């Protein structure tokens, strides 16, 4: 099986910042997971990578010249993107994998979320 992903269809960044919540159909409390944000239709660029611990600790990484921050919450991960450029207006996709406790699962392709940076 696969995890489900609900993300807002549209978000306007105000003052070059936005909060992208990725809603999963899985209990990420006390789980070893790896959440991802990808930008672009071809999902090439990986914007942010939020690794989750069993003891609900987070290791957030911002890879491609993005200012990313991460917050965990039950069946969701929130990506707080700051200092976005206007030229970064695009479709963003939430990705997830759970490893422990088993089984290993990944997400079914989400519809994405259009971020308009103003």
């Amino acid at each position, epitope marked *: 099986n696969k995890i489900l992903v609900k993300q807002s269809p549209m978000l306007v960044a105000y003052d070059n910042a936005v909060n992208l919540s990725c809603k999963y159909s899985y209990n990420l409390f006390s789980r*070893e997971f790896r959440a991802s944000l990808h930008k672009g239709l071809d999902s090439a660029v990986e914007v942010c990578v939020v690794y989750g611990n069993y003891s609900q600790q987070l290791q957030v990484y911002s890879k491609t010249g993005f200012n990313c921050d991460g917050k965990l919450g039950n069946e969701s991960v929130t990506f707080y993107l700051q200092n976005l450029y206007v030229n970064q207006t695009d479709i963003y996709f939430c990705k997830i994998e759970v*490893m422990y406790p088993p089984p290993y699962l990944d997400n079914e392709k989400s519809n994405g979320t259009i971020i308009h940076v103003k």
Partner: antibody
Amino acid sequence: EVQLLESGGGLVQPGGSLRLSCAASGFTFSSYAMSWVRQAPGKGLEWVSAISGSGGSTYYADSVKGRFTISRDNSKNTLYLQMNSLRAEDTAVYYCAKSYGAFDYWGQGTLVTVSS
Amino acid sequence: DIVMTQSPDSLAVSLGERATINCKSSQSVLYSSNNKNYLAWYQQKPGQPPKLLIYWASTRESGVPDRFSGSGSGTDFTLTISSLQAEDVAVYYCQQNLRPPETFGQGTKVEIKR
């Protein structure tokens, strides 16, 4: 028929490096987490490391941290283990295992002997 | 650092009679979210790679006979072979898969008493 076939083991000097491989068939390799489990001759099983179906998440045992690296090529259906800075203690039969709720399938094993 | 301790180290039981192996976890491997205990049992015959028998403490793997049965929750667990067969002489291992690093018990050697 699911098959896991290990290779790359044998005799190596202490301090030296060895790379193990585990080829898979008979299932969608990229859909499952893989592990390496080792068993020293006449001893119990010791979990070594695990890698997600995608390769994005890797975990390691306390004893092998900083020395061993678990990787995979889903296009080749092969799982790798890069053992560096080997010690005598690392001598064991190295199994590769497919996970789903537990280790539901195990390979035959490849014998790594670390000795001068 | 979740430690698994089995008992006994060795066990000899007559053909057809009941065998019991205990496995004690140093921390509760009961996941409160789905009430499942993340504990597995393997059988390892000599010179052969291990074989999964039980997972989620009591759920029996495809093709494992009715006689193997896992039981317990939290920290103490039990594997039961109702009617020991000749083909069951192996070393049994318990294993937690709740959190990394995954850890195994020391193993229990089961023998036929004759």
